[PDB]
Coordinates of C-alpha atoms in Angstrom, one line a residue:
Chain A
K1 CA 135.5 102.4 111.0
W2 CA 133.2 105.1 109.5
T3 CA 129.5 105.2 110.5
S4 CA 127.2 107.4 108.4
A5 CA 124.0 108.5 110.1
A6 CA 120.6 109.8 109.3
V7 CA 117.7 110.9 111.5
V8 CA 114.1 110.6 110.1
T9 CA 110.7 111.7 111.4
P10 CA 107.1 111.2 109.9
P11 CA 106.6 113.4 106.8
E12 CA 104.9 116.8 107.1
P13 CA 101.7 118.2 105.6
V14 CA 103.6 120.2 103.0
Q15 CA 105.1 117.1 101.5
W16 CA 101.7 115.6 101.0
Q17 CA 100.0 118.1 98.7
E18 CA 100.2 116.3 95.4
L19 CA 98.8 113.3 97.2
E20 CA 96.1 115.5 98.7
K21 CA 95.0 116.8 95.3
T22 CA 94.5 113.2 94.1
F23 CA 92.5 112.2 97.1
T24 CA 90.3 115.2 96.3
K25 CA 89.3 113.9 92.9
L26 CA 88.3 110.7 94.5
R27 CA 86.4 112.4 97.3
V28 CA 84.1 114.0 94.7
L29 CA 83.4 110.5 93.3
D30 CA 82.3 109.2 96.8
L31 CA 85.6 107.6 97.6
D32 CA 87.1 108.7 100.8
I33 CA 90.7 107.6 101.1
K34 CA 94.0 108.9 102.4
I35 CA 97.6 107.7 102.9
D36 CA 98.1 108.3 106.5
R37 CA 101.4 110.2 107.0
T38 CA 102.5 108.2 110.1
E39 CA 101.5 104.9 108.5
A40 CA 103.8 105.6 105.5
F41 CA 106.6 106.4 107.9
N42 CA 106.1 103.2 109.8
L43 CA 106.0 101.3 106.5
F44 CA 109.3 102.9 105.5
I45 CA 110.8 101.8 108.8
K46 CA 109.5 98.2 108.5
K47 CA 110.8 98.0 105.0
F48 CA 114.1 99.5 105.9
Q49 CA 114.6 96.8 108.5
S50 CA 113.8 94.0 106.0
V51 CA 117.1 92.0 105.6
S52 CA 115.9 90.5 102.3
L53 CA 115.2 94.0 100.9
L54 CA 118.6 95.1 102.0
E55 CA 120.4 92.2 100.3
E56 CA 118.5 92.9 97.1
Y57 CA 119.5 96.5 97.2
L58 CA 123.1 95.6 97.7
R59 CA 123.2 92.9 94.9
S60 CA 121.5 95.3 92.5
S61 CA 123.8 98.2 93.3
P62 CA 126.6 98.7 90.7
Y63 CA 128.5 100.9 93.3
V64 CA 128.6 98.0 95.8
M65 CA 129.5 95.4 93.2
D66 CA 132.8 97.1 92.5
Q67 CA 134.1 96.0 95.9
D68 CA 134.4 87.1 94.3
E69 CA 132.5 83.8 93.7
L70 CA 130.1 82.5 96.4
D71 CA 131.9 84.6 98.9
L72 CA 129.7 87.1 97.1
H73 CA 126.8 85.9 99.3
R74 CA 129.1 86.1 102.4
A75 CA 130.3 89.6 101.7
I76 CA 126.6 90.6 101.3
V77 CA 125.6 89.0 104.6
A78 CA 128.5 90.8 106.2
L79 CA 127.7 94.1 104.7
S80 CA 124.0 93.8 105.5
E81 CA 125.0 93.5 109.2
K82 CA 126.0 97.1 109.2
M83 CA 122.6 98.7 108.4
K84 CA 120.9 99.6 111.7
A85 CA 117.7 101.4 112.6
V86 CA 117.0 102.6 116.1
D87 CA 114.0 104.3 117.5
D88 CA 115.4 107.3 119.4
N89 CA 112.8 106.9 122.1
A90 CA 113.3 103.3 123.0
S91 CA 116.5 104.2 124.9
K92 CA 115.2 106.4 127.8
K93 CA 111.9 104.7 127.9
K94 CA 108.2 105.7 128.8
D95 CA 107.0 108.5 131.2
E96 CA 109.0 111.0 129.1
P97 CA 106.8 111.4 125.9
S98 CA 108.2 112.2 122.6
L99 CA 107.2 115.4 121.0
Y100 CA 107.9 113.9 117.7
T101 CA 108.7 110.3 116.6
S102 CA 112.2 109.9 115.2
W103 CA 114.6 107.2 114.2
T104 CA 118.3 106.9 113.6
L105 CA 119.3 105.1 110.5
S106 CA 123.0 104.2 110.0
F107 CA 125.6 102.4 108.0
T108 CA 129.2 101.6 109.0
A109 CA 131.9 101.3 106.3
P110 CA 135.7 101.0 105.5
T111 CA 135.5 104.5 104.1
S112 CA 133.6 107.7 104.8
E113 CA 132.4 108.0 101.2
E114 CA 131.3 104.4 101.1
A115 CA 129.1 104.7 104.2
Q116 CA 127.3 107.8 103.0
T117 CA 126.7 106.6 99.4
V118 CA 125.3 103.4 100.7
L119 CA 123.0 104.8 103.3
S120 CA 121.5 107.3 100.8
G121 CA 121.2 104.7 98.1
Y122 CA 119.5 102.3 100.4
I123 CA 117.2 104.9 101.8
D124 CA 116.1 106.1 98.3
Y125 CA 115.6 102.5 97.4
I126 CA 113.3 101.7 100.3
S127 CA 111.6 105.1 99.9
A128 CA 110.6 104.2 96.3
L129 CA 109.2 100.9 97.5
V130 CA 106.9 102.7 99.9
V131 CA 105.8 105.1 97.2
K132 CA 105.1 102.3 94.7
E133 CA 103.1 100.2 97.2
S134 CA 101.2 103.2 98.5
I135 CA 100.0 104.2 95.1
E136 CA 99.2 100.5 94.5
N137 CA 96.9 100.5 97.5
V138 CA 95.2 103.6 96.4
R139 CA 94.7 102.2 92.9
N140 CA 93.3 99.0 94.4
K141 CA 90.8 100.9 96.5
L142 CA 89.6 102.6 93.3
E143 CA 89.4 99.2 91.6
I144 CA 87.1 97.8 94.3
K145 CA 85.0 101.0 94.5
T146 CA 84.5 100.7 90.8
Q147 CA 83.7 97.0 90.8
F148 CA 81.2 97.5 93.6
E149 CA 79.3 100.4 92.1
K150 CA 79.2 98.8 88.6
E151 CA 77.9 95.6 90.0
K152 CA 75.3 97.2 92.3
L153 CA 73.9 99.2 89.4
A154 CA 73.5 96.1 87.3
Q155 CA 71.6 94.6 90.2
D156 CA 69.5 97.7 90.9
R157 CA 68.4 97.8 87.2
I158 CA 67.3 94.2 87.4
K159 CA 65.5 94.9 90.8
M160 CA 63.6 97.7 89.2
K161 CA 62.6 95.9 86.0
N162 CA 61.2 93.3 88.5
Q163 CA 59.3 95.9 90.5
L164 CA 58.0 97.5 87.2
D165 CA 56.8 94.1 85.9
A166 CA 54.9 93.5 89.2
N167 CA 53.4 96.9 88.7
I168 CA 52.3 96.2 85.2
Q169 CA 50.4 93.1 86.4
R170 CA 48.7 95.2 89.2
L171 CA 47.9 97.9 86.7
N172 CA 46.3 95.3 84.4
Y173 CA 44.1 94.3 87.2
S174 CA 43.3 97.9 88.2
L175 CA 42.1 98.2 84.7
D176 CA 39.7 95.2 85.0
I177 CA 38.4 96.5 88.3
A178 CA 37.8 100.0 87.1
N179 CA 36.0 98.7 84.0
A180 CA 33.8 96.5 86.2
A181 CA 33.0 99.4 88.5
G182 CA 32.2 101.8 85.6
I183 CA 35.0 104.3 86.3
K184 CA 36.0 105.5 82.9
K185 CA 37.0 109.1 83.6
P186 CA 39.0 109.9 86.7
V187 CA 37.1 109.9 89.9
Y188 CA 35.9 113.4 91.1
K189 CA 39.1 106.9 98.5
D190 CA 41.1 104.5 96.5
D191 CA 41.4 100.8 96.8
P192 CA 44.7 100.0 98.5
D193 CA 45.5 97.0 96.3
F194 CA 44.5 98.1 92.8
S195 CA 44.2 101.8 92.4
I196 CA 41.4 102.9 90.1
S197 CA 40.8 106.6 90.8
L198 CA 42.6 107.4 87.5
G199 CA 39.7 105.7 85.6
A200 CA 39.9 103.1 82.8
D201 CA 40.7 105.6 80.0
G202 CA 43.7 106.9 82.0
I203 CA 44.8 103.5 83.2
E204 CA 44.8 102.1 79.6
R205 CA 47.2 104.8 78.6
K206 CA 49.3 104.5 81.8
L207 CA 49.5 100.8 81.0
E208 CA 50.8 101.1 77.4
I209 CA 53.3 103.6 78.8
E210 CA 54.7 101.3 81.5
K211 CA 54.7 98.4 79.1
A212 CA 56.8 100.4 76.6
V213 CA 59.5 101.2 79.1
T214 CA 62.8 99.6 78.3
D215 CA 65.6 101.2 80.2
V216 CA 64.4 101.7 83.8
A217 CA 66.7 104.8 84.0
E218 CA 64.5 106.7 81.6
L219 CA 62.2 107.8 84.4
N220 CA 64.6 107.3 87.3
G221 CA 67.2 110.1 87.9
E222 CA 68.9 108.3 90.7
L223 CA 69.8 105.6 88.1
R224 CA 71.0 108.1 85.6
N225 CA 73.2 109.5 88.3
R226 CA 74.5 106.1 89.3
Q227 CA 75.3 105.4 85.7
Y228 CA 77.1 108.7 85.6
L229 CA 79.1 107.8 88.8
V230 CA 80.3 104.5 87.4
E231 CA 81.3 106.2 84.1
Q232 CA 83.4 108.7 86.2
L233 CA 85.0 106.0 88.4
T234 CA 85.9 104.1 85.3
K235 CA 87.5 107.1 83.8
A236 CA 89.3 108.2 86.9
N237 CA 92.9 107.3 87.4
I238 CA 95.7 107.8 89.9
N239 CA 98.8 109.3 88.5
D240 CA 102.3 108.2 89.4
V241 CA 102.7 110.7 92.2
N242 CA 106.0 111.1 94.0
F243 CA 106.5 111.8 97.6
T244 CA 108.9 111.1 100.5
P245 CA 107.6 109.0 103.3
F246 CA 109.7 110.8 105.9
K247 CA 111.2 114.2 106.8
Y248 CA 115.0 114.2 107.4
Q249 CA 116.1 115.8 110.6
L250 CA 119.6 114.7 109.7
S251 CA 120.2 113.6 106.1
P252 CA 122.9 111.0 105.8
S253 CA 126.1 112.4 107.2
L254 CA 129.7 112.4 106.1
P255 CA 131.5 111.1 109.1
Chain J
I1 CA 111.5 123.3 118.4
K2 CA 111.5 120.3 116.0
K3 CA 113.1 122.4 113.3
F4 CA 115.6 123.8 115.8
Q5 CA 116.7 120.3 116.9
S6 CA 117.4 119.5 113.3
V7 CA 121.1 119.2 112.7
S8 CA 120.8 119.6 108.9
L9 CA 118.8 122.8 109.2
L10 CA 121.5 124.0 111.5
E11 CA 124.3 123.1 109.2
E12 CA 122.5 124.9 106.4
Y13 CA 122.2 128.0 108.6
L14 CA 125.9 128.1 109.6
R15 CA 127.1 127.6 106.0
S16 CA 124.8 130.3 104.8
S17 CA 125.9 132.8 107.4
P18 CA 128.2 135.7 106.5
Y19 CA 129.1 136.1 110.2
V20 CA 130.1 132.4 110.5
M21 CA 132.1 132.1 107.2
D22 CA 134.6 134.5 108.7
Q23 CA 135.6 132.3 111.6
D24 CA 139.4 127.0 104.5
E25 CA 139.3 123.7 102.5
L26 CA 136.9 120.9 103.3
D27 CA 138.1 121.1 106.8
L28 CA 135.2 123.5 106.7
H29 CA 132.8 120.6 107.1
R30 CA 134.6 119.5 110.3
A31 CA 134.3 123.0 111.7
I32 CA 130.6 123.2 110.9
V33 CA 130.1 119.7 112.5
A34 CA 132.0 121.1 115.5
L35 CA 129.9 124.3 115.7
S36 CA 126.7 122.3 115.2
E37 CA 127.4 120.2 118.4
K38 CA 127.3 123.4 120.5
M39 CA 123.6 124.3 119.8
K40 CA 121.4 122.8 122.5
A41 CA 117.7 122.8 123.1
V42 CA 116.3 121.3 126.3
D43 CA 112.8 121.0 127.8
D44 CA 112.8 122.7 131.2
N45 CA 110.2 120.3 132.5
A46 CA 111.8 117.1 131.5
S47 CA 114.6 117.5 134.1
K48 CA 112.2 117.5 137.0
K49 CA 109.8 114.8 138.3
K50 CA 107.1 114.5 135.5

């Protein structure tokens, strides 16, 4: 009796600026992620067409619940049959491209008011779902990035303590060789397996030094900087940012 | 062209137009809806063999 209508297209760059700021913080921390503007639109459409999501919206809507037992379910099934979504470019098919994407969302009701309040309500409801999940994905990507770097650092530290311990053994042997060969002061070439050009005096000292090394990051700036990175990822967070996953061409009409 | 084709922008324009608010209840809405239907935008190359 009264159909309310809306026409929606993928959202525009100007609507995405708070999002873009957030992606920028993450880009500095070596994490390169976006929410594609067309993918968020498609997700809105998919969600909109979910009958289970629609029933949930209806049941949860005080407005709808004004209009009485287990006919409740039946009234819901019946109401839910009057949300439609159509791609505007399915009808009149290929060979004639679409400048822009665009869908028609609609609800038909007993009254004019009813159809418009219920199309808006449902739209805003689905829109919030897209927003919530999209932030969730972003947060998840941050979680994984963090898990990864944190774990790789732990590994790299053990890998270098290993490399350093192997070097200490080699250095011990360099020391024996240099002593045997009578090189005490530096040489004024080298053995490829046990370097000795430094001389025994110098090697002894180099040896106490390497043996007194605890945190492998002390002499390794790439590790300090990886530690730093992980501190920053751990401290970074993604704020509840609000956006619309579409641009209205026609916002829900009053028939 | 996209913004042109947008009915809601169009309605906002008509409502915001001194000129248009001369040509008086909430019949207003119907009149706007009526005017809006008379704006057309057509690709000259669509209506010819692509």
